[PDB]
Ligand binder design. Sequence first.
Ligand SMILES: O=C(O)c1ccccc1C(=O)NCc1c(Cl)cccc1Sc1ccc(Cl)cc1Cl
Ligand SMILES: [Mg+2]
Ligand SMILES: [Mg+2]
Length: 284
Amino acid sequence: MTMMDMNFKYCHKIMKKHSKSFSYAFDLLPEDQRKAVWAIYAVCRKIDDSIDVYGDIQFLNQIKEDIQSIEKYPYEYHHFQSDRRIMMALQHVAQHKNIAFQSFYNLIDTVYKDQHFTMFETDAELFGYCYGVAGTVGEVLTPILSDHETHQTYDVARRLGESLQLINILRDVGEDFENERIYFSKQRLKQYEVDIAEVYQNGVNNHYIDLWEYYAAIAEKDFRDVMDQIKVFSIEAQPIIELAARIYIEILDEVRQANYTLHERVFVEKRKKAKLFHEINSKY
Ligand SMILES: O=C(O)c1ccccc1C(=O)NCc1c(Cl)cccc1Sc1ccc(Cl)cc1Cl
Ligand SMILES: [Mg+2]
Ligand SMILES: [Mg+2]
């Protein structure tokens, strides 16, 4: 294996460690496309984890400067300040694909902002957050997952990303609360008469379930709209994206089956993923 092979294998390790679902689906892409996804995934993960390395924005600033170096001089040799393996792989991708760098900067700005997290007043603010951490990622992936990017391709990829984030939120209510984070909006919490701290201590109730299902209906409708527009993506990526999406839709049912528990993280069995892919592939 070459040095560059090693860099990509490391990016892959980071992705599989963080998400079995996404790795399962994306590893099914053709070699050059899946490697590009690994690199983008590893960069975004490093960004999300950056603050906790020392406890401030040092490492994140270094990541940002590395990405700016690649943007400005794609073909020059760089001595990277952050994670060399990841940045070398990213640069390799950037030489072959049109990366939306401002989308990385948007993600980084969202992470900076998260240092002074205050709850969202409205769902509009929640959805803006979903764009920031996940719609941005869809934008970056767009040139990898489509042959000819148009505004529709970015729109669909952005919507998919934001739907996946909403599902993450719906899965992780309990864990996020423990980490002093609540992502449901103050408007919606008040409208449904829900107090997460109260639910965390005393268990689910009908008001909570209604609030949860309100957001779940949103994620579900977005997912359906992505599915109706699946053809914006390359023929090879279409079944993979459908699979990633369908696995995440299944997380919602796992939550329901676990009675919306705030005290464990539910998941889709690896064997159940394989089943969904069989069902999808047949159609392809
Ligand atoms: O989920 C967090 O905790 C988080 C918080 C902030 C930043 C990143 C993440 C994060 O783990 N993102 C997962 C991810 C990365 Cl990282 C790389 C590539 C793909 C994906 S999954 C995907 C597939 C399709 C679309 Cl349209 C959008 C996405 Cl997100
Ligand atoms: Mg996160
Ligand atoms: Mg989360």
